[PDB]
Amino acid sequence: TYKYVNLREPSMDMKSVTDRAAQTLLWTELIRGLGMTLSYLFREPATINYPFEKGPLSPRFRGEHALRRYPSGEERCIACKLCEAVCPAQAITIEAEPRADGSRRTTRYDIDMTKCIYCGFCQEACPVDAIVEGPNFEFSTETHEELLYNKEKLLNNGDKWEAEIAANIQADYLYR
Amino acid sequence: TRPTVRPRNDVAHKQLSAFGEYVAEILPKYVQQVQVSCFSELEICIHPDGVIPVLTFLRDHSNAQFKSLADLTAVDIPTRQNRFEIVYNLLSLRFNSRIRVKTYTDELTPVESSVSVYKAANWYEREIWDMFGVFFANHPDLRRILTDYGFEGHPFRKDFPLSGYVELRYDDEVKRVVAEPVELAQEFRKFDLNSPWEAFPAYRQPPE
Amino acid sequence: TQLITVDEKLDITTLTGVPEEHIKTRKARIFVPARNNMQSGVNNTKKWKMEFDTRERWENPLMGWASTADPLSNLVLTFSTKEDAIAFAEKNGWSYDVEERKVPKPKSKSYGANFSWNKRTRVSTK
Amino acid sequence: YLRVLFRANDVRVGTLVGEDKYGNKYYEDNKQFFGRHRWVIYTTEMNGKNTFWDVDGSMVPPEWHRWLHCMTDDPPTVKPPTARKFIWTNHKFNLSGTPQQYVPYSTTRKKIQEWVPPSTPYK
Amino acid sequence: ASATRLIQGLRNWASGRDLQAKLQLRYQEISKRTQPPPKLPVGPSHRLSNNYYCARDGRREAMPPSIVMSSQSEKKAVSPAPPIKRWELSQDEPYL
Amino acid sequence: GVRTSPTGEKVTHTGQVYDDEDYRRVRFVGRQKEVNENFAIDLIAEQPVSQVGSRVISCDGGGGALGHPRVYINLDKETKTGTCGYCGLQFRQQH
Amino acid sequence: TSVKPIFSRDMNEAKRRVRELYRAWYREVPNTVHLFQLDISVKQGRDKVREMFKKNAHVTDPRVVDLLVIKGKMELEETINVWKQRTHVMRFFHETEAPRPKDFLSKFYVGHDP
Amino acid sequence: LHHAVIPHGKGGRSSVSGIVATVFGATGFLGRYLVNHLGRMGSQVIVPYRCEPYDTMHLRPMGDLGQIIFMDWNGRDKDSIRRAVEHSNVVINLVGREWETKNFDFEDVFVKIPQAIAQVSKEAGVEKFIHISHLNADIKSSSKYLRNKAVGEKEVRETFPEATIIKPADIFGREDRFLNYFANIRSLGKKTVKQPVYIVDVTKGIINAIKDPDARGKTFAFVGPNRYLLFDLVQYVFAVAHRPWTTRDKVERIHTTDRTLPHLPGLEDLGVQATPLELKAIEVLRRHRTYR
Numbered sequence A: 001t002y003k004y005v006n007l008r009e010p011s012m013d014m015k016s017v018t019d020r021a022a023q024t025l026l027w028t029e030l031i032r033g034l035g036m037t038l039s040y041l042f043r044e045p046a047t048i049n050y051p052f053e054k055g056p057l058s059p060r061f062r063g064e065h066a067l068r069r070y071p072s073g074e075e076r077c078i079a080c081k082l083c084e085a086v087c088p089a090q091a092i093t094i095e096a097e098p099r100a101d102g103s104r105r106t107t108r109y110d111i112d113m114t115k116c117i118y119c120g121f122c123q124e125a126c127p128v129d130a131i132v133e134g135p136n137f138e139f140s141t142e143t144h145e146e147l148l149y150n151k152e153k154l155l156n157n158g159d160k161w162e163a164e165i166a167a168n169i170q171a172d173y174l175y176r
Numbered sequence B: 001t002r003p004t005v006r007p008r009n010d011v012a013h014k015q016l017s018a019f020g021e022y023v024a025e026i027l028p029k030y031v032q033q034v035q036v037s038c039f040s041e042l043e044i045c046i047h048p049d050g051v052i053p054v055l056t057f058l059r060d061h062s063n064a065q066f067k068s069l070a071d072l073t074a075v076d077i078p079t080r081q082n083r084f085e086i087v088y089n090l091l092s093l094r095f096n097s098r099i100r101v102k103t104y105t106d107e108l109t110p111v112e113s114s115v116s117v118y119k120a121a122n123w124y125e126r127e128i129w130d131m132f133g134v135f136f137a138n139h140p141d142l143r144r145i146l147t148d149y150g151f152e153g154h155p156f157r158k159d160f161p162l163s164g165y166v167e168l169r170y171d172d173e174v175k176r177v178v179a180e181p182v183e184l185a186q187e188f189r190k191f192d193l194n195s196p197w198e199a200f201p202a203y204r205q206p207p208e
Numbered sequence C: 001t002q003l004i005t006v007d008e009k010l011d012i013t014t015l016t017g018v019p020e021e022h023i024k025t026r027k028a029r030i031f032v033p034a035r036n037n038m039q040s041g042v043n044n045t046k047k048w049k050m051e052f053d054t055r056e057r058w059e060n061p062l063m064g065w066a067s068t069a070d071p072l073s074n075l076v077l078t079f080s081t082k083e084d085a086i087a088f089a090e091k092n093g094w095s096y097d098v099e100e101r102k103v104p105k106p107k108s109k110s111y112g113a114n115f116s117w118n119k120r121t122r123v124s125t126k
Numbered sequence D: 001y002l003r004v005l006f007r008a009n010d011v012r013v014g015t016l017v018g019e020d021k022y023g024n025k026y027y028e029d030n031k032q033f034f035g036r037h038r039w040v041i042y043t044t045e046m047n048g049k050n051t052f053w054d055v056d057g058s059m060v061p062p063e064w065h066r067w068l069h070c071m072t073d074d075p076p077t078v079k080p081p082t083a084r085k086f087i088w089t090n091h092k093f094n095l096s097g098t099p100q101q102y103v104p105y106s107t108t109r110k111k112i113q114e115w116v117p118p119s120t121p122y123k
Numbered sequence E: 001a002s003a004t005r006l007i008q009g010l011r012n013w014a015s016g017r018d019l020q021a022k023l024q025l026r027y028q029e030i031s032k033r034t035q036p037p038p039k040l041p042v043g044p045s046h047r048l049s050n051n052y053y054c055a056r057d058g059r060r061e062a063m064p065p066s067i068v069m070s071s072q073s074e075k076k077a078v079s080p081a082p083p084i085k086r087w088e089l090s091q092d093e094p095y096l
Numbered sequence F: 001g002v003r004t005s006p007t008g009e010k011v012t013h014t015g016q017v018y019d020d021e022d023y024r025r026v027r028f029v030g031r032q033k034e035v036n037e038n039f040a041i042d043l044i045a046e047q048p049v050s051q052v053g054s055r056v057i058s059c060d061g062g063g064g065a066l067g068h069p070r071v072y073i074n075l076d077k078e079t080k081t082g083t084c085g086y087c088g089l090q091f092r093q094q095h
Numbered sequence G: 001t002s003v004k005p006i007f008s009r010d011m012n013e014a015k016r017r018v019r020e021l022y023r024a025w026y027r028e029v030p031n032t033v034h035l036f037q038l039d040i041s042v043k044q045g046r047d048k049v050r051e052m053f054k055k056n057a058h059v060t061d062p063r064v065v066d067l068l069v070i071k072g073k074m075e076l077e078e079t080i081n082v083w084k085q086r087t088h089v090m091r092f093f094h095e096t097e098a099p100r101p102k103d104f105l106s107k108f109y110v111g112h113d114p
Numbered sequence H: 001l002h003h004a005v006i007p008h009g010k011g012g013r014s015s016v017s018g019i020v021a022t023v024f025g026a027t028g029f030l031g032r033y034l035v036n037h038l039g040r041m042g043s044q045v046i047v048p049y050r051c052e053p054y055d056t057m058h059l060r061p062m063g064d065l066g067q068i069i070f071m072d073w074n075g076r077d078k079d080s081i082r083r084a085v086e087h088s089n090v091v092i093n094l095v096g097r098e099w100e101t102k103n104f105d106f107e108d109v110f111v112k113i114p115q116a117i118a119q120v121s122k123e124a125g126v127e128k129f130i131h132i133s134h135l136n137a138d139i140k141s142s143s144k145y146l147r148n149k150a151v152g153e154k155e156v157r158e159t160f161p162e163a164t165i166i167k168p169a170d171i172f173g174r175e176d177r178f179l180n181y182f183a184n185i186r187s188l189g190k191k192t193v194k195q196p197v198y199i200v201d202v203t204k205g206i207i208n209a210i211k212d213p214d215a216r217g218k219t220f221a222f223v224g225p226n227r228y229l230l231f232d233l234v235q236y237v238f239a240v241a242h243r244p245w246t247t248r249d250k251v252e253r254i255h256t257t258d259r260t261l262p263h264l265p266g267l268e269d270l271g272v273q274a275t276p277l278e279l280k281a282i283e284v285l286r287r288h289r290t291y292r
């Protein structure tokens, strides 16, 4: 099935040729184009005003790279290094240490935000949902040093909101 | 089986085996291997002295049009007498069939630059000259494409490493961009991912 | 067209344009990566790896990362034989040190040898 | 009125969903399109930075951040409590461009631990 | 909506498009977010008692390539694939 | 809570706090060395270790797919509490 | 190893083509150093040209000598056009030191080096 | 020396050298090219500024990832200077405005600024504090500039006597001042001998002085080997140029002299090759319309 276009001879009727000559002299469908421009002129614009009327989003949006901790508990990460194994730009830098009691935990947890490409493979691979893609997007930095994060930065970034992330996961846990 | 396994074809496999046997008979001068895999796309594998004859015969002879070209690639493999593999990949307009035309070569011996029968291969040949080093005799212009001007090395080799030997930064001492030996800021921690326990038993070469 | 042959090596060592310290000083090592003993199985054998000597990795002064001045640190050239390994090393230019391939010697073992009336192999727990 | 006449443009108060601590105001309408359901009015000097002018994003608390980016349909005054106690209740807001912002440092102890020269001398 | 009828008449007068009907202001046609959560089932598997991985192991059936000629009175000359017959004209308004 | 180094500043929860002649201190000039004052070990001390009447018990962490996979711990020795590897909270038995 | 040739059947046309290349580079310097508005005398650029020819004294095979002539002819094309720039020609020069040493004593103090 | 202060690897771009530099000034010319060579060397540069942050953003792309760092001070306080010199391995003093502002005279900048900073530098236990000075800074008359720099030399020799005083001649470079005034034309006949010195040999001598000991105490000089007349230099600069807030302390400086002192070592004794003014003058003699 094909539908090939631009095949006509010009119809040489007197009425057809005087309509096309009037189109040549008066620029008629040019005025029809002006009519379309007025028809969009007399609408109302679908803009948003930026600080006061924010644009919509999705529940599965991937921003801040925060960390969760347990319900009335401590750090949800184990340092199991699956997020480094799936992080494609190798932005995850993890050097673990077991803590002062014996249970396996971290020392050096680094998300190189200059290298992160915002997939969610660390969101998929994380077997306890410790690392979570955050909701918001204001990094917006006047320096380079403040882009690269550390463990206490990410945990302060996860202590600024939890029920945000818990609400998004409770919306999204059946699908992913 | 009936779901979740991609079903194989039969009669198309038969016709491509017949056509490969046809080509292999009617060109005794440049034929080493013809093979069909499970997904039924024909492969011909060729000594590098009849490249323009095979492409002229596979453009015409009227039971094989194959008017569309793809990719040329001389895919780099070590360990061999002939590393580089020119891989033509041809599609026909009247037929709906796919052939791969793989001829082999080493690091220095040129081939005859088949731009004169397929005009598409001009920038392809210039690009694979810039990236590999397979020199192309009887060719109008070999410039460098997809590389820097002052850079060289043919960097798609397995000898040229992932990061380069060159680095660029700016200085205001001489008010311009200068080159340096490379200084990575991270290790590129290479992941050992070679599993044991015989990943595919059907592809066992005879052990030495 | 049947040009002359000569008993020489190949000289791409100035065609590839790698700098001279990385040409000469990188003493290569050809080795068989043997069986990872914490695993089991020699599937990862049969592939001669040409790799290079390691150099320094210093502390990144902001993060403690291992910043290196090495292009030739992460290469791994996968071969099938030893003669072609020597041929590639003479072809591209550098020198090298060679390990052998040390296959497991097969030993006679039997459960009927694990048990005996007058030999001193006695599991005493199975 | 000069407040909202030179705040940005609007006059569209008339739905009155509510407010939140830092005083900020949140208004949800259904009469407009999807994109101007929920709008926000920022107060003045919420943390002493004179935020009548030069208003920032993320001067909002995060429950209204989820409500206002069109991820839910009901305000966070529908479900007030949550039984988690570790969270910030100060809300150090967006801060890139202050003398109070992040600096990076590797949470890593000493690596090789050089030999100690002896205390007492000799000879 | 929320417009006077004179400018609506001007919008129809500018072009015959009936701009009041579909207007690029999605009001309530979007489904109301945070529905009750729907379940995600599993298809032709996860029933017990039969589903061997020995049966449906299409990954381990990748065959080695089959070969013909190498270095190691015929009523013939077929095509690689049958000549597909020329297509059909359009039903709904081709030119012509 | 934060401790007191001889630099007069906030130490870290893992022992990386600076020496008195580190110039990383003098690249921390005039800005916040940020720290999470909530520490991980400070919450385990306020955990009521529960008393389950079985022998080998389960742990999920408050609902499947919100937490950690099913781990099964043992309550044999009465001299040691049964510590989860994921939860970081103990368990005991009575009889 | 009865290899196909490239341009030359022996070393004679190899030396002839590389001396023609060096002829072209000698008559190629003043036009480019007057056009590109550099900071360097004509004689210094010509001496780096003859130095870069002096670097490759150990090249023997006719394929390799012809391939060096091919690289030099391609670069002379890209410098008789202004496809390249001032940055590339000053990258042929090595002026921004990099004073990196060679003495074993200075490979020893500034060390971790062969 | 503390750990992670020791040198590492090949030079430049995370080569944590044995210096931690604290530079005063550097918003202008010579200190900016000095920070340029330090970022080429790859150390951490602590630099303060009281100016608009444009020039410190301008010197941001110099060092590696987060190496250089910026702060603030003024010619009133002590706390900010102490905060700059809290933990500094090496420290250098470039300062001086060549005209009189309404609150900083030529007086009391060279008197009040190197005293406090060099005193708290000795009170911070630093090694190899370097301070600049002009050539022939004499107590002799007709030079407010040179006599205030001589008083600065006296103060720096008084407190922490083993500080490295560096005196070059006039400095021609890429953004020169006196050679710009030479080019700044549109009838006068005078003469005075003079020889200048090039900026990158000066700063290579600076870094050799800052990382090569046996250098302290004794002051160093850095003069190019020219030794000719002002009239030949005016003919030279106008033949290369192809043409037919300022005070007269400028014209006093360029009609003073350039005499030598054989008491102190110079370029070849410190070991850096001296370059004449020819092709660098061809560099810095632009702006002409169609002869290139």
Ligand SMILES: NC(=O)C1=CN([C@@H]2O[C@H](COP(=O)(O)OP(=O)(O)OC[C@H]3O[C@@H](n4cnc5c(N)ncnc54)[C@H](OP(=O)(O)O)[C@@H]3O)[C@@H](O)[C@H]2O)C=CC1
Pocket: H024, H025, H026, H027, H028, H029, H030, H031, H049, H050, H051, H074, H075, H093, H094, H095, H096, H097, H098, H104, H109, H132, H133, H134, H135, H167, H168, H169, H170, H171, H177
């Ligand atoms: N050949 C020689 O030996 C000569 C040496 N010099 C010396 O070398 C250096 C560079 O030379 P030059 O080009 O003339 O000058 P510059 O403009 O390069 O450097 C002068 C510096 O002094 C700073 N400064 C001066 N007064 C104050 C103040 N009150 N508060 C804060 N900062 C102040 C300036 O800061 P900012 O610009 O931000 O206000 C600037 O960073 C100077 O120290 C100068 O004394 C100068 C001339 C000749």
Ligand code: SF4
Pocket: A076, A077, A078, A079, A080, A081, A082, A083, A084, A094, A122, A125, A126, A127, A128, A129, A130, A131
């Ligand atoms: S995948 Fe999750 S649990 Fe594992 S190391 Fe990464 S953050 Fe920790």
Ligand code: SF4
Pocket: A083, A086, A087, A088, A089, A090, A091, A092, A111, A115, A116, A117, A118, A119, A120, A121, A122, A123
């Ligand atoms: S989102 Fe992607 S790039 Fe970013 S940390 Fe996760 S895996 Fe890495």
Ligand SMILES: [Zn+2]
Pocket: F059, F060, F061, F068, F071, F084, F085, F086, F087, F088
């Ligand atoms: Zn658990």
